[PDB]
């Protein structure tokens, strides 16, 4: 099912992603 999960992952906003990755490191 990882097939469809990559589809959805592509609809992730790069700006949101990095903001979140940064947040979990910094906090």
């Amino acid at each position, epitope marked *: 099912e990882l097939l469809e999960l990559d589809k959805w992952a*592509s*609809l*992730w*906003n*790069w*700006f949101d*992603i*990095t*903001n979140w*990755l*940064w947040y979990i*490191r910094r906090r």
Partner: antibody
Framework: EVQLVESGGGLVKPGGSLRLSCSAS????????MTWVRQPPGKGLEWVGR??????????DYAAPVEGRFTISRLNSINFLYLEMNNLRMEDSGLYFC??????????????????????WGRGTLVTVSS | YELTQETGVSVALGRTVTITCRGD??????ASWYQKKPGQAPILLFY???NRPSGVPDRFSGSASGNRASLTISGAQAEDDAEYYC????????????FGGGTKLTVLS
């Protein structure tokens, strides 16, 4: 296998308009960020603007000198990037490149929104703005 | 003028040389490096913390500290005689990008 071919350059009068094109193949264009870069005569490279992907709603960012005059758009069904330029002025003149744009972010040391890099380039199309 | 590079750098054939890029954003963001010959499409040489694209000779390597980023060529060759541009964010946290003014590398004698 990556191929980028710009076209649409030529002579335009100050105040005029022009549409540049860039055909792309050999990669997943639909999910690719794409950037326009220009080289004015006798100068170095200058970032013009970049259009993002589906996840960002095809958002576009523009360089200050170009804001409100240029529009970057894309047609995914034919893998074409466009740059529409209005109210062109002499300083607009240069060689225009399109570039397949990668996104990079280092988890441990990175700062949002990371950075963008130009993994493949076309040979450019020459725009001359002159009376 | 957010990213500043040496205007010109000369190096002996087969010697080592370092080109640098400096700007406020570099303390937060990595730079990427491009080779450009007049008449030719630019080529990506190096990006991020330590990424060298496939196809690029191993003598090109990049590094960073403080507000500076460096491109180092080891055993520089005659065909390395070119222009070199760094690129990064214009400001820390910006969605825009910018290039340095470029460096002409002359591979001497």
């Amino acid at each position: 296998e990556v191929q980028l071919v710009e076209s649409g350059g030529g002579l335009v009068k100050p105040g005029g308009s022009l549409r540049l094109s860039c055909s792309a193949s050999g990669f997943d264009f639909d999910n690719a960020w794409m950037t326009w870069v220009r080289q004015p005569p006798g100068k170095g490279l200058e970032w013009v603007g970049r259009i993002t992907g589906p996840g960002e709603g095809w958002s576009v960012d523009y360089a200050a000198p170009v804001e409100g005059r240029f529009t970057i758009s894309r047609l995914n069904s034919i893998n074409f990037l466009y740059l529409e330029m209005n109210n062109l002025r002499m300083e607009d003149s240069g060689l225009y490149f399109c570039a397949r744009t990668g996104k990079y972010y280092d988890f441990w040391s990175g700062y949002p929104p990371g950075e963008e890099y130009f993994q493949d380039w076309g040979r450019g199309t020459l725009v001359t703005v002159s009376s | 003028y957010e990213l500043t590079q040496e205007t010109g750098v000369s190096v002996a054939l087969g010697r080592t040389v370092t080109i640098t890029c400096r700007g406020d954003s570099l303390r937060s963001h990595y730079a990427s490096w491009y080779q450009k010959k007049p008449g030719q499409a630019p080529i990506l040489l190096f990006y991020g913390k330590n990424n060298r694209p496939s196809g690029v000779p191993d003598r090109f390597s990049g590094s960073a500290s403080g507000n500076r980023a460096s491109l180092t060529i080891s055993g520089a060759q005659a065909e390395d005689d070119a222009e070199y541009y760094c690129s990064s964010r214009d400001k820390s946290g910006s969605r825009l990008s910018v290039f340095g003014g470029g460096t002409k590398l002359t591979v001497l004698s």
